[PDB]
Write a protein that binds this ligand. Sequence first.
Ligand SMILES: Nc1nc(O[C@H](c2ccc(-c3cccc(F)c3)cc2)C(F)(F)F)cc(-c2ccc(C[C@H](N)C(=O)O)cc2)n1
Ligand SMILES: [Fe+3]
Length: 274
Amino acid sequence: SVPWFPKKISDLDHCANRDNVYRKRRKYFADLAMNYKHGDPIPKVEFTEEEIKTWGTVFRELNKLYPTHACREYLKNLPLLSKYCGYREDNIPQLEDVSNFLKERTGFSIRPVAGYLSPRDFLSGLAFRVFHCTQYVRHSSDPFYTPEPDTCHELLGHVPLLAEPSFAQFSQEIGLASLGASEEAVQKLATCYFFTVEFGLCKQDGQLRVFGAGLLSSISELKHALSGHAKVKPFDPKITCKQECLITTFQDVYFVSESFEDAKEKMREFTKTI
Ligand SMILES: Nc1nc(O[C@H](c2ccc(-c3cccc(F)c3)cc2)C(F)(F)F)cc(-c2ccc(C[C@H](N)C(=O)O)cc2)n1
Ligand SMILES: [Fe+3]
């Protein structure tokens, strides 16, 4: 039959909840997400000195790389976020501020999330231009890479591209295609999402650039992706969807899209086939 799926933005309420000082702090963030209901302003957080320091390292080092590494669309939106959302080395932007910024730019909004959602639930949010974002910060011991998404990843990796109309359309269309889809169809869409939105490369003016959020938030993998000691293949949904998504490590392959326009067109033809 058809699995349950959200029919309106508020329906995401029904799925978005599915050392030791660090553990209590993570519990603090998890509770903020769990207690959140659509319509609420997203709770603003007073980040600790250690948290801000970790952000600062990530922010400072990544901004050295972006001009030569990030796609043009990313670079176009990054300064607007400094101006309007408080993106500075000494300040961690608030999810509420960035959500409101996105709402005016592309209709995207943010919802705080306690941890990992199922691909089905995560993608369902995108259908309504809702991006589920973590609020906690990377453990201070490794600013260069983290196996789990943190707020640094959401804010530096995802947000600047969600502010771009062509990318927001591409993202929503993955979400829309997933709604009520088979288990097999969701996995293929989630893999395409992973190798574009999370870890994608694109060719711009003949050169390789990165648009993958998971690359754009990792000092170490961003350098690795374009080094180039990594394997790169063309983005092709029927091939890309079979690729294993790696966690805990750098990816073993990166897929190259021609443009956000082209990636969207390839996804449109592919979703008809499944
Ligand atoms: N969208 C997505 N998926 C990830 O993992 C996938 C994943 C998919 C589904 C689940 C899942 C969770 C809960 C229930 C369920 F059924 C499935 C968990 C992880 C998979 F394992 F497939 F690769 C991992 C990430 C990710 C993880 C970490 C980072 C941080 C980055 N490396 C950095 O250092 O900034 C950026 C992105 N993003
Ligand atoms: Fe992500």
